[PDB]
Design an enzyme around this catalytic site. Structure first.
Site, short mmCIF file in Angstrom:
data_model
loop_
_atom_site.label_atom_id
_atom_site.label_comp_id
_atom_site.label_asym_id
_atom_site.label_seq_id
_atom_site.Cartn_x
_atom_site.Cartn_y
_atom_site.Cartn_z
N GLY A 168 22.67 39.73 -8.95
CA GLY A 168 22.05 38.90 -7.93
C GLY A 168 22.04 39.52 -6.55
N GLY B 215 23.30 44.36 -13.43
CA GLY B 215 24.39 44.40 -12.48
C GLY B 215 25.73 44.05 -13.08
N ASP C 201 15.47 49.98 -13.55
CA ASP C 201 16.07 48.73 -13.09
C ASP C 201 17.29 48.46 -13.96
OD1 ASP C 201 15.13 45.21 -13.36
OD2 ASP C 201 16.74 46.17 -12.23
N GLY D 160 19.21 42.16 -5.76
CA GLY D 160 17.83 42.51 -5.46
C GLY D 160 17.21 43.65 -6.25
N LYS D 161 17.88 44.15 -7.28
CA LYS D 161 17.33 45.25 -8.08
C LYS D 161 15.96 44.89 -8.65
CE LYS D 161 22.13 45.51 -9.26
NZ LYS D 161 22.24 44.95 -7.89
N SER D 162 15.89 43.75 -9.33
CA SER D 162 14.66 43.33 -9.98
C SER D 162 13.58 43.08 -8.93
CB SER D 162 14.90 42.07 -10.80
OG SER D 162 15.82 42.31 -11.85
N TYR D 163 13.95 42.46 -7.82
CA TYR D 163 12.99 42.18 -6.76
C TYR D 163 12.46 43.48 -6.16
CZ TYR D 163 12.28 42.01 -1.69
OH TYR D 163 11.84 42.24 -0.41
N1 ANP Z 1 15.38 42.08 0.35
C1 ANP Z 1 15.19 40.85 -0.13
N2 ANP Z 1 14.43 39.99 0.59
C2 ANP Z 1 14.23 38.76 0.10
N3 ANP Z 1 14.68 38.22 -1.04
C3 ANP Z 1 15.42 39.10 -1.72
C4 ANP Z 1 15.71 40.40 -1.36
N4 ANP Z 1 16.50 41.02 -2.31
C5 ANP Z 1 16.66 40.09 -3.22
N5 ANP Z 1 16.04 38.91 -2.94
C6 ANP Z 1 16.04 37.70 -3.75
O1 ANP Z 1 17.38 37.38 -4.05
C7 ANP Z 1 17.54 37.13 -5.47
C8 ANP Z 1 18.37 38.24 -6.08
O2 ANP Z 1 17.51 39.33 -6.46
P1 ANP Z 1 17.43 39.87 -7.95
O3 ANP Z 1 16.37 40.90 -8.00
O4 ANP Z 1 17.24 38.72 -8.95
O5 ANP Z 1 18.84 40.51 -8.24
P2 ANP Z 1 19.06 41.17 -9.63
O6 ANP Z 1 20.22 42.11 -9.58
O7 ANP Z 1 17.79 41.96 -10.03
N6 ANP Z 1 19.35 39.98 -10.76
P3 ANP Z 1 20.37 40.58 -11.97
O8 ANP Z 1 19.53 40.96 -13.15
O9 ANP Z 1 21.42 39.49 -12.40
O10 ANP Z 1 21.13 41.86 -11.43
C9 ANP Z 1 16.12 36.98 -6.02
O11 ANP Z 1 15.71 35.62 -5.98
C10 ANP Z 1 15.30 37.86 -5.08
O12 ANP Z 1 13.96 37.40 -4.96
MG MG Z 2 17.59 41.72 -12.68
#
Ligand code: ANP
Ligand code: MG
Ligand code: TA1
Ligand code: GTP
Ligand code: GDP
Ligand code: MG
Lengths: 386, 432, 451, 38
Positions: free
Chosen positions: A97, A248, A245, A99-102
């Site tokens: 959680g 985490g 990607d 931001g990797k996926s985002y």
């Molecule tokens: N730089 C950013 N600006 C705005 N929103 C962000 C940013 N980075 C992350 N988010 C948001 O915060 C949340 C966490 O990002 P997410 O990409 O889901 O983490 P993640 O590591 O990919 N999930 P996970 O598979 O459990 O590791 C999501 O709802 C994103 O849209």
């Molecule tokens: Mg993810």
């Protein structure tokens, strides 16, 4: 060349604003300062990275970094390197959680897209304008996931099985029977990406409502063809863009996992621990053989302990130009995790790489010998012998 | 209740398994017809580790016998303990592998693996709480190597959370019995390094050396080698069956012996061994057992431990004895031989004690070492492998069955990387 | 059911078959008339081993053998002899003339109209079989039938059956002594077929067997019966592994897997160690080391060629009797330390070992002593090239002047065929000279990058 | 009058070009070294 390092701090989620909402990340230019919430007297430890992005405050102009800013900093340069004939990689890192996926994918239904969307957009553009009678381009796409140390294909969902990982003597590890598909337009790669994202395994946990359950690798094979009458290099460059990607690290207490979720978390943590061990060692050895002196006796980097590090052998070291994008959370409660990411990111700064342009070895030797003949002819002619 | 499924493949595996079942049946007081005729009440308390119960108050071993040549199966049925096994578990075909790893793995074994897995599923689904599997086979052969590796891969795909043991007889430098041992050994090790939790190395050269030098036998046959191996197998899993002052499950040994996942090749050993005529001179006690435990000539893998260092070792004692003496002796062995143990693992000796010894002995003990000297053995195979792969000595037999040079090259690379990984910790310095 | 089908072609094949089937009948307790009293006295058993004999309802045992010839004489001697009631009456003997020391006559002209019957009966025998292992073809180089008809039969069998192993025992022409003026033509013609269509060819030479009989058995005046009995002992040793129990059993596929490095090198030599008379059986221990050493003595080889002039590429030792593995290991270790025995550097292992419990039997009226131990060695080496080269020279000395050629062209050949065969032979010889060469010094020329 | 035929070996284009270019490099380098220009 060295591994490029970018860090990116994100805003609050519902979980953090419900609980304590004090930030610990501060940032300026290319320097990121962490502050321990439990020890206000201690020094505000700081780290220097090649890039640092602040997405905490949406409307402010105080070094705010949208999706485009990150892309123009990292992905545009990496695609330029791809056109230069180099294999390139961008891989995400951090805890759950963050931001990797985002960052890598983003939300398609918005003006806020990930690196992979904008990279394929800009690539399709550049091949479209630079098309000529003699110059031509071809591109192919593939997308795999590592779920439980088992490789699955995303584009074709009917495969329904674990593919086999092989080792070419010259080209290193690869995946056999991976459904690489040819594409011709940005709509095609968009359809492939949406099918792949639908194919990935995603489950809801307390830390994230859509936590990823598997590492994912998106591979673009790009080929430039320059055909002319004289001897012009045909199918000269063949580059590979690897957009990774990773899932985490998780803690069972905060994640609340049970049954299948806990086993998935255990496998993810095993793979990430092996990745961290490999990163630390590539680092030390390089830095040494680099600073130490130059013995180069023998250093063993444990690539084989996991399939993730095995497939990414050439990207983490050797023949690739690689970049590491670390995600960071602002919340105080996550401090002990975030620092760890930063620490590994610092070690990622030390790792080096050795990438070279690709070609047929027979044509390589022929070109080199022709250049030597030309140089010797010019030297003899200048001195009055030729 | 922890219970084990047993699999046998090939001639060597079948014969070692037959001797092992003879030994275990003797230990639990099982008649060759299947009836119980023991004396102690603790023999039946944990009989269900290896045996299923049957309606006439009988006991049937949880064994699966596998081969591609029928003849070996007959030699098991027409024997002292042939009738103990249930005939439904004798799985076999025709047209044996012919010392060809490709036939055992890809062509012939691919048809019989389904039947063998069906019997494995039937035995495993009736288990109260399955602990793990153990497979006996020979790496330097045909059906043994190939079908053992295939079964191991399939089972690890089906039962990932369970333990996978393996007792392998691998080629020796001097004693050679087939011409293409290096190919089979290399491919088998390439599979085993991936798909196994523990692997006990056994060498015929070391067993012949034990028989000649320690037991003073003049005509050792394969029965005596099976005897030594079966004693080791029983010693490994003693603690699941009998009580003790300090237990040690298979998982405890795996955790305390394996520092990193790929280094799980173990050197086994047994004590005492007295030669039937010198036992009246030697006093039996924990110091004598420890002295014979760590002696170079007593090891079963034909790899001298003095050429490397011990990453880890484990000692499982059987008999009434004091824990103070055991701990003191292991501590002394560490300090006196300070140069044969790594410096980044404090107290790299594991200890277990079981109360009930073997039937005829007041004391006994078994040894499971994990040292870098094992790399020597792999290096040897690799050398021979290169000497036959540069010229493609016998490659057409393997490529006719549906293989290619790619598999040979990747197996060789994996073995070399394993050798390097062991060699990383061999030399001194490193420290803190 | 490790079943084998034996095919005997020509006079030499039929006589070796007589010796072989005498030995097999005596090993298994079968009488000449096909009955086995041992089962009747005991009440039942496995003694009707399916490798060679097929059991009918009445208790008779019919062998799995096929005899072929173009002369009625050699097999009419069998139809009215001691074993007239053992074989099935169908014996496949063309009531016509013979190939007349002519490859063309036996391959093209008269080999037809007998081939169809032979393959039909072979099909009938193969249909009765479950888990057929291979064929054992006995014939002779230098004869008309044994060369040409064996060529045709092998070609048709390779077309029809394909995957089954086909081992070949054959009598190569000797260096000096001969029984025909046109031996080299037939041998060079049939090499072109035995190279492609066989899987492993064992060659024996009559001069070598006469020398062994003179020196070891003290027989001053041997006949073909003694040579056939020795060959029968060797074939029994080869096939014993799939008839009786043993510590290490070696089937017919392990043979080919271990002794044949490349597909075109399947010409191993064969030797039998404890060849000794009854009187000299005393004053001797006959231990494992002695017989293993005697297998490697050049004097005991069955083909007139010196192994010291070549290099060993593979060895397969098959032991019978009161033998244990440790003595075999000690003997192999002793042999590996001798400098006169050289192995190719690309075969570090070298040895295959098989052990069987059944000791060899004694034929009444024979000349071999009763022994407790025995070993048969099979060695794929490079010295065999010498045995070919001599023959090649002889062929040239006749083909420069086209002597005896019109007999061959008159029966359906053309001249160029001869040349073709000769060229093939050269290629085969060249291959041996290429495989015995030591690997180039530090095979990757040299190496040593940074660190 | 069967006469010697000799084989029909010829140049391989890639190996031919490599060999000729290597020989030319060697010749030009030798010429430069002989006159003190290398
Ligand atoms: N730089 C950013 N600006 C705005 N929103 C962000 C940013 N980075 C992350 N988010 C948001 O915060 C949340 C966490 O990002 P997410 O990409 O889901 O983490 P993640 O590591 O990919 N999930 P996970 O598979 O459990 O590791 C999501 O709802 C994103 O849209
Ligand atoms: Mg993810
Ligand atoms: C006076 C007396 O009892 O004699 C001993 C004996 O002389 C010695 C030499 C025995 C003896 O063993 C051997 O001679 C031997 C020969 C070849 C290979 C292995 C052993 C003994 O045969 C073996 C036998 O051992 C056992 O019964 C153990 O329980 C053993 N079980 C079996 O061997 C066995 C045999 C047949 C059927 C079923 C089991 C065992 C060991 C470890 C774990 C489980 C079981 C014993 C006590 C003896 C003899 C009889 C001479 C030894 O036996 C072992 C391995 O425990 C060899 O060194 C030990 C120590 C003993 O002093
Ligand atoms: N060892 C051995 N060799 C034999 C025997 N009989 C014949 N030969 C050899 O066989 C060679 C001649 O070939 P044959 O077997 O007679 O050919 P064939 O079977 O008669 O066929 P045809 O010539 O058409 O009649 C001779 O050189 C003999 O040395 C035998 O009984 N034992
Ligand atoms: N210890 C022991 N080793 C054996 C025995 N039988 C065969 N071997 C070994 O196994 C190897 C041959 O492998 P094999 O069993 O034939 O493989 P398989 O054909 O697949 O069953 C040889 O190198 C022998 O040393 C036995 O009874 N005991
Ligand atoms: Mg005749």
């Amino acid at each position: 060349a060295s591994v490029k390092v970018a860090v990116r701090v994100r805003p609050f989620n519902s979980r953090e604003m419900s609980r304590d909402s004090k930030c610990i990340i501060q940032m300026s230019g290319s320097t990121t300062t962490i502050v321990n919430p439990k020890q206000p007297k201690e020094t505000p430890k700081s780290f220097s990275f090649d890039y640092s992005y602040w997405s905490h405050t949406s409307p402010e102009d105080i070094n705010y970094a949208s999706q485009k800013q990150v892309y123009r900093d990292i992905g545009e340069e990496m695609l330029q390197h791809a056109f230069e004939g180099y294999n390139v990689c961008i891989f995400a890192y951090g805890q759950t959680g963050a931001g990797k996926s985002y960052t890598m994918m983003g939300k398609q239904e918005k003006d806020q897209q990930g690196i992979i969307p904008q990279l394929c957009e800009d690539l399709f553009s550049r091949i479209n304008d630079t098309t000529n009678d003699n110059m031509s381009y071809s591109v192919e796409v593939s997308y795999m996931e590592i779920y439980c140390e088992r490789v699955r294909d995303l584009l074709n969902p009917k495969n329904k099985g674990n593919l086999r990982v092989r080792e070419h003597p010259l080209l290193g590890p690869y995946v056999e029977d991976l459904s690489k598909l040819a594409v011709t337009s940005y709509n095609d790669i968009q359809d492939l990406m949406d099918s792949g994202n639908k194919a990935r395994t995603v489950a809801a946990t307390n830390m994230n409502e859509t936590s990823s359950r598997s590492h994912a690798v998106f591979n673009i094979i790009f080929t430039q063809k320059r055909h002319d009458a004289e001897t012009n290099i045909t199918t000269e460059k063949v580059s590979k863009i690897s957009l990774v990607d990773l899932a985490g690290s998780e803690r069972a207490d905060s994640t609340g996992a049970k049954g299948t979720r806990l086993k998935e978390g255990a496998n993810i943590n095993k793979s990430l621990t092996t990745l961290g061990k490999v990163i630390s060692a590539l680092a030390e050895m390089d830095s040494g053989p680099n600073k130490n002196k130059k013995k180069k006796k023998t250093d063993f980097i444990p690539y084989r302990d996991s399939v993730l590090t095995w497939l990414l052998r050439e990207n983490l070291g050797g023949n690739s130009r690689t970049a590491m994008v670390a995600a960071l959370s602002p919340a105080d409660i996550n401090y002990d995790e975030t620092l760890s990411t930063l620490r590994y990111a610092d070690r990622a700064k030390q790792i080096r790489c050795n990438a070279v342009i690709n070609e047929d070895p027979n044509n390589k030797l022929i070109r080199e010998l022709k250049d030597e003949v030309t140089r010797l002819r010019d030297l003899l002619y200048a001195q009055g012998l030729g | 209740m922890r219970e084990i499924v047993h699999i046998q493949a090939g001639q060597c595996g079948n014969q070692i398994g037959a001797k092992f079942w003879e030994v275990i049946s003797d230990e639990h007081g099982i008649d060759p017809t299947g009836s119980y005729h023991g004396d102690s009440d603790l023999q039946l308390e944990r009989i269900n580790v290896y045996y299923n119960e049957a309606t006439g108050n009988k006991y049937v071993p949880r064994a699966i016998l596998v081969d591609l040549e029928p003849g070996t199966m007959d030699s098991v049925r027409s024997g002292p303990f042939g009738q103990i096994f249930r005939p439904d578990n004798f799985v076999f075909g025709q047209s044996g592998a012919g010392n060809n790893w490709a036939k055992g793995h890809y062509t012939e074994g691919a048809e019989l693996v389904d039947s063998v897995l069906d019997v494995v599923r039937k035995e495993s689904e009736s288990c109260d709480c399955l602990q793990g599997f153990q497979l006996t086979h020979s790496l330097g052969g045909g059906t043994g190597s190939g079908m053992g590796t295939l079964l191991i891969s399939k089972i690890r795909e089906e039962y990932p959370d369970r333990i996978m043991n393996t007792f392998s007889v691998m080629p020796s430098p001097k004693v050679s019995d087939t011409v293409v041992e290096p190919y089979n050994a290399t491919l088998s090790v390439h599979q085993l390094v991936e798909n196994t939790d523990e692997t006990y190395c056994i060498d015929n050269e070391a067993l012949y050396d034990i028989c000649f030098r320690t037991l003073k036998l003049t005509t050792p046959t394969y029965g005596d080698l099976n005897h030594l191996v079966s004693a080791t197998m029983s010693g490994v899993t003693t603690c699941l069956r009998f009580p003790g002052q300090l237990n040690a499950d298979l998982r405890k040994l795996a955790v305390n012996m394996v520092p990193f996942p790929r280094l799980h090749f173990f050197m086994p050993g047994f004590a005492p061994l007295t030669s039937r005529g010198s036992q009246q001179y030697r006093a039996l006690t924990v110091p004598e057992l420890t002295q014979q435990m760590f002696d170079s000539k007593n090891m079963m893998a034909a790899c001298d431990p003095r050429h490397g260092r011990y990453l880890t070792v484990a000692a499982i004692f059987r008999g009434r004895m004091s824990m103070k003496e055991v701990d003191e002796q292991m501590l002394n062995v560490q300090n006196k031989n300070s140069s044969y143990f790594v410096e980044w693992i404090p107290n790299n000796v594991k200890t277990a004690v079981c109360d009930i010894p073997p039937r005829g002995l007041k004391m006994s003990a078994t040894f499971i070492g994990n040292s870098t000297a094992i790399q020597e053995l792999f290096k040897r195979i690799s050398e021979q492998f290169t000497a036959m792969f540069r010229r493609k000595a016998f490659l057409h037999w393997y490529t006719g069955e549906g293989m290619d040079e790619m598999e040979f090259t990747e197996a060789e690379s994996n073995m070399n990387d394993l050798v390097s990984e062991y060699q990383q910790y061999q030399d001194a310095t490193a420290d803190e | 059911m490790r079943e084998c089908i034996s095919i005997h072609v020509g006079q030499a094949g039929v006589q070796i078959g007589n010796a072989c089937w005498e030995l097999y009948c005596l090993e298994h307790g079968i009488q000449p008339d096909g009955q086995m009293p041992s089962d009747k006295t005991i009440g039942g058993g496995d003694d009707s081993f399916n490798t060679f004999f097929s059991e009918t309802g009445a208790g008779k045992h019919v062998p799995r053998a096929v005899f072929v010839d173009l002369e009625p004489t050699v097999i009419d001697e069998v139809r009215t002899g001691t074993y007239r009631q053992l074989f099935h009456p169908e014996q496949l003997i063309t009531g016509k003339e013979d190939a007349a020391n002519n490859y063309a006559r036996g391959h093209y002209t008269i080999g037809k109209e007998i081939i169809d019957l032979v393959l039909d009966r072979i099909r009938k025998l193969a249909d009765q079989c479950t888990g057929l292992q291979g064929f054992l073809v006995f014939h002779s180089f230098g004869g008309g039938t044994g060369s040409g008809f064996t060529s045709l039969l092998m070609e048709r069998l390779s077309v029809d059956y394909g995957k089954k192993s086909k081992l070949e025992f054959s009598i190569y022409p000797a260096p000096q002594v001969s029984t025909a003026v046109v031996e080299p033509y037939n041998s060079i013609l049939t090499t072109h077929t035995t190279l492609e269509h066989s899987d492993c060819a064992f060659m024996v030479d009559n001069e070598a067997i006469y020398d062994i009989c003179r020196r070891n058995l003290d027989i001053e005046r041997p006949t073909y019966t003694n040579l056939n009995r020795l060959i029968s002992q060797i074939v029994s040793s080869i096939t014993a592994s799939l008839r009786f129990d043993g510590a290490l059993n070696v089937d017919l596929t392990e043979f080919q897997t271990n002794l044949v490095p490349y597909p075109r090198i399947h010409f191993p030599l064969a030797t039998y160690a404890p060849v000794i008379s009854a009187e000299k059986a005393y004053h001797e221990q006959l231990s494992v080391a002695e017989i293993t050493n005697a297998c490697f003595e050049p004097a005991n080889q069955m083909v007139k060629c010196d192994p010291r002039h070549g290099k060993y590429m593979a060895c397969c030792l098959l032991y019978r009797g009161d033998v244990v593995p440790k003595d075999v290991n000690a003997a192999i270790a002793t042999i590996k330390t001798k400098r006169s025995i050289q192995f190719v550097d690309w075969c570090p292992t070298g040895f295959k070992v098989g052990i069987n419990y059944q000791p060899p039997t004694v034929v009444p009226g024979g000349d071999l002593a009763k022994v407790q131990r025995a070993v048969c060695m099979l060695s794929n080496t490079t010295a065999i090239a010498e045995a070919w080269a001599r023959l090649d020279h002889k062929f040239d000395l006749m083909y420069a002047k086209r002597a005896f050629v019109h007999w061959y062209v008159g029966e359906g050949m053309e001249e160029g065929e001869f040349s073709e065969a000769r060229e093939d032979m050269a290629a085969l010889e060249k291959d041996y000279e290429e495989v015995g060469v030591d690997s180039v010094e530090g095979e990757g020329e040299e190496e040593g990058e940074e660190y």
